[PDB]
């Protein structure tokens, strides 16, 4: 390592909400040196050095009077002298008040590596450990930022207003580096995807197309080949030193009156696998670093928000301060925490403004609605079940447990679970119900790339590789091409047509975004619900039986209010609502009606 | 009908908390008459008459100065005169402050008709519609109060301190009258069971044995052959006049932000079946009647509490006032509402002191813990599941949702679900885990009669008849006799021995009653939890695998705190707790340890 190998964060901005900034400087005996600076607006508060001489922490106070510009930080000591030019940048017009992703938005999820290979010459990069292999389910397939940029029109054309790629941060692992969740450098886009400047261009080109960028961020852990592991800043930088202490995933322990400390500590401090070292956020140096890094990425790349991986696995108090600091900087931003639980109360604990039994406060605006996805997936897979949708209905009834239930992210699927189409039992009619549900519910809708052309996977066992297959048309010489429509089967085309039809339609429905919901108890696996304000009503009625069903419309008259008939958006045909509602086998109708008197 | 066919309630008491009393008088043109009385302490507030001339409602105010004694109520009008002697009774010493059933208690549930036939001569009673048939699963088998009294020693000897029989109120139906849930006379014990005086004697003889009496009460509905149905007091006395409007059981509609009025009304006003007319508690006359009737039974029979059938199906506001009035009269009483939901939030809504989103208040101290029973039953039935107990653990973690979670009633089973032993897959070792769980959890334990000798039933479909088979030894000439132990198989005896061993032991464990609980996340379908105060610790460890398991005791050291070994209460053998815990295949240990420093 040189005298300054790492300066983190590499640059900052003038006029941030939180005036403070702790620089993590890394370099040969840099911690044996005094620091000084001469710049108007900036004051050097203090320096903190640790037993490891190769690190120095420098505390700056950047006042409101401080102007955009650069200055040298001079390090004296050890009979040596060092200069480092530190840059304070000017913020973009309306940076702090930026519009986060909301109920109006629709999210398209991609795995950058598995989406599109716009540049084959960055499939392998000299120095990087893992060699690219498209034939291996866990290998690097070659997808990159160039590829994603090339087809932003496909995404915007589908009707989506947000792009959430899985992490693009450097994952210099020997094995399974494609997934992005084992960071080895927090401030560098993996060169296999492109440069840092390429990531900014992704955000700006998407912005032109009328799309925001949502970064997948990991706070809880890193990769075993992170440059920290060969030169640990502090002995307590990662949890459980050198001996492998795996977590046993007891998530309720942080919100359980009967919880043992052993379970609680095991959950927040335990490693996922031997290759993912768990960060210690109770160390204030680690906490500050993570907060600053994520803010850095938002400001630098013009992100509309974040998805926070493995949310609850980070220190609860850290998460409190983390979500506070980030929402202090961007008060209208949105961040969606991944809390993998099909239980509503377990998820609800983490949302902004939730009154908890233990007095836990949070500023996390959004969470992944795993309960509602799981209930609907169960309802469609369960053949013999007489009234499977009851599970969806009852789960929705629990929304009072969330402080903001209509701000949660609902999804057709993701990279971590069975393909949407396969989860429906490879049934187009059921898949349609799932799609309509997703697009009409009082939630932020998220869609996984490939589900629009009915991609398949295994439904049981662990087979993460099968959920993450290459997007047809992403690679040069692809048989099937989902971008142009070449090589697709009639069913795949119709599925793509429908996703496009429905999502673009959803963009022009403020009644789906901000309006109210009235649902009815499912009866004989049939379900009827309404989106409504004074401007519009949307009746969604679905029949989850392979026999035709007729529902008396007298039951729904507090919503119908005399309306004689309504035009289905899907089929186009007018459906009779006067006396009885005739529903076709395994069918769904989206009926639009005038505003309620 | 005579000039006064019914005077309800038939008598009252001096010195009640609520001073008011509305008499429902029934008789030939009784409603065409003025009422008057001359008694010191009692004032006639007003009379209310309805379009049906055969009924009069008389409002009395019984002041604190009023003495025990009788007086004539004189009815003038129609050119007629009538006398009725009304009795005000003296209350028992400490009647209002009576001790309800609590965590210390243990409940034995019987179906009076299916328990013991102490008197064959009341199997049929002249006048009553349904003839007794012991051979028919839905027939009257002949069980009675005499039979229950005869074997109160068996029940107290088992270790139980409470007796909850299903309703004994007159059910004069043509079909399925044995179950008791279709009342035809609210103020009369069904003559097939005995007289009203016989029911009091049941309570007093049990009290001598150190047992309380818990009455199963139905508030929501009656039987189609209730004497009301042939002479309805008001047109709105029952819901939905003459046309059959069945309920579709959408219980969440009374606690759902997205609920339609149609679902909410359907739940509270819909009939169960064509033969069970739904009472309208929004009629103040019905509300008053039900409240007074249940209070009457408590005071009259010296009940330690109630189990409220089909709880949520009654009007929410009525239930508020109902639970208020009853708890005003008996502040230390306990009442356990049946809210059939495996979901914690749905059940929790009804408990006393629960802060609800809609501002719903309740005074119901207890509810049936269907979530925790269902989670544990799932955990034992699920063979292939790697870690099935996780469901029990996670459900327990949700107790913060209840205002008083440790006051809920947990049960091995009941008359409405598959036999406890059959639910365990006819596995004695699993049944044992279920039993220990029931007896050691921070709950009020309830046990279903027959489960102590491993009675069997079908596990799927509807077969209520199979859950309610005759108790062996209850009838003269029974092959098997569970009271004396004659004809029982080795397994049945050992099961009975264990229930007796454990329940009597539970009586002397205040640490199980009032103490704290610390559980640990189940790992590989093994589970470890602790009951603890400063006096005692109870380690319960169970292994739900047919292979032996070893658990490092270092994990549980915040509870163990150095303890080198402990004596299992079940086997008697000392189990090593120093380094590792050796658990036998499908085994459970109950280890008692000194108080925590
Ligand atoms: Ca590439
Ligand atoms: Ca962690
Ligand atoms: Ca009898
Ligand atoms: Ca009712």
From TrEMBL, chains A, B:
All copies of domain Glycosyl hydrolase family 13 catalytic, residue ranges:
109-506
Q: Which GO terms describe its biological process?
A: carbohydrate metabolic process
* InterPro entries linked: Cyc-maltodext_N, Cyclo-malto-dextrinase_C, GH, GH13_cat_dom, Glyco_hydro_b, Ig-like_fold, Ig_E-set
Q: Does the keyword Hydrolase apply?
A: yes
Which superkingdom heads the taxonomic lineage of this protein's source? Bacteria
* Single annotated GO MF: metal ion binding
EC number(s) in its UniProt entry? Answer: 3.2.1.54
EC top class, as a word: hydrolase
Record-listed Ca(2+) 1 binding positions: 117, 119, 122-123, 142, 144
Keyword Signal listed? The answer is yes
Q: Where does Ca(2+) 2 bind?
A: 220, 268, 278, 313
Known Pfam families for this protein?
Answer: Alpha-amylase, Cyc-maltodext_C, Cyc-maltodext_N
What positions does the entry give for Ca(2+) 3 binding? 278
User: What UniProt keywords are attached to this protein's entry?
Assistant: Calcium, Glycosidase, Hydrolase, Metal-binding, Signal
- List the PANTHER family hit by this protein, alphabetically: ALPHA-AMYLASE FAMILY MEMBER (PTHR10357), MALTODEXTRIN GLUCOSIDASE (PTHR10357:SF210)
- Spell out the protein name for this chain: Cyclomaltodextrinase
**Organism listed in the record:** Flavobacterium sp. 92
**Its encoding gene is what?**
cdase
């Amino acid at each position: 390592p040189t005298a300054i190998e790492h300066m983190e964060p590499p640059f900052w901005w003038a006029g941030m909400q939180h005036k403070g900034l702790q620089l993590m400087v890394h370099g040969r005996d840099i911690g044996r040196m005094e620091a000084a600076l001469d710049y108007p607006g900036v004051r050097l508060v203090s320096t903190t050095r640790v037993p490891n001489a190769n690190y120095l922490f420098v505390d700056l106070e950047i006042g409101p009077e401080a102007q955009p510009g650069s200055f040298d930080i001079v390090f004296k000591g050890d009979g040596r002298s060092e200069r480092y030019r530190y840059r304070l940048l000017a913020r973009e017009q309306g940076s702090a008040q930026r519009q986060g992703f909301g109920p109006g938005d629709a999210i398209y999820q991609i795995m950058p590596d598995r989406f599109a290979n716009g540049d084959p010459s960055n499939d392998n990069v000299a120095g990087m450990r893992e060699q690219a292999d498209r034939r291996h389910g866990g290998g690097r397939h070659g997808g990159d930022i160039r590829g994603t940029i090339d087809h932003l029109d496909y995404i915007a054309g589908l009707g989506f207003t947000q792009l959430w790629p899985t992490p693009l941060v450097e994952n210099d692992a020997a094995a399974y580096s494609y997934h992005g969740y084992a960071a080895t450098d927090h401030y560098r886009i993996d060169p296999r995807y492109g440069s840092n400047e390429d990531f900014v261009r992704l955000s700006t080109e998407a912005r032109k197309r009328g799309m925001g960028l949502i970064q997948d961020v990991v706070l809880s852990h890193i990769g075993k080949h992170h440059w920290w592991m060969k030169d640990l800043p502090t002995p307590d930088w990662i949890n459980y030193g050198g001996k492998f202490v795996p977590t046993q995933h007891h998530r309720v322990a942080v919100q359980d009156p009967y919880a043992a400390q052993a379970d609680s500590e095991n959950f927040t401090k335990g490693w996922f696998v031997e290759g993912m070292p768990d960060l210690n956020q109770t160390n204030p140096l680690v906490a500050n670093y993570l907060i600053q890094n994520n803010i850095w990425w938002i400001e630098y790349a013009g992100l509309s928000g974040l998805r926070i991986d493995t949310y609850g696995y980070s220190d609860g108090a850290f998460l409190t301060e983390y979500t506070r600091r980030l929402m202090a900087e961007y008060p209208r931003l949105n961040m969606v925490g991944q809390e993998w639980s099909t239980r509503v109360p377990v998820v609800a604990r983490w949302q902004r403004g939730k009154a908890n039994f233990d007095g836990y406060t949070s500023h996390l605006p959004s969470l992944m609605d795993f309960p509602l996805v799981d209930a609907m997936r169960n309802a469609l897979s369960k053949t013999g079940e007489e009234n499977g949708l009851n599970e969806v209905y009852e789960t929705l009834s629990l929304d009072y447990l969330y402080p903001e239930p209509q701000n949660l992210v609902l999804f057709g699927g993701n990279h971590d679970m069975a393909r949407m189409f396969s989860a429906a039992g490879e049934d187009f009619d059921r898949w349609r119900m799932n799609l309509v549900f997703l697009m009409t519910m009082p939630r932020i809708p998220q869609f996984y790339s490939g589900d629009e052309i009915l991609m398949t996977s295994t439904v049981k066992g662990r087979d993460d590789a099968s959920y993450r297959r290459d997007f047809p048309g992403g690679w040069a010489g692809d048989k099937a091409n989902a971008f142009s429509g070449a090589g697709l089967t009639s069913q795949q085309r119709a599925a793509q047509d429908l996703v496009r039809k429905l999502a673009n339609w959803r963009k022009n429905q403020p009644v789906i975004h901000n309006g109210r919901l009235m649902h009815f108890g499912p009866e004989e696996n049939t379900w009827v619900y309404f989106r409504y304000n004074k401007d519009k009503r949307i009746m969604v009625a679905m029949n989850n039986n392979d026999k035709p069903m007729t529902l008396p419309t007298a039951r729904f008259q507090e919503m119908l209010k005399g309306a004689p008939s309504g035009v289905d958006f899907l089929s186009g045909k007018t459906v009779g609502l006067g006396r009885e509602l005739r529903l076709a086998p395994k069918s769904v109708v989206v009926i639009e009606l005038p505003g309620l008197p």
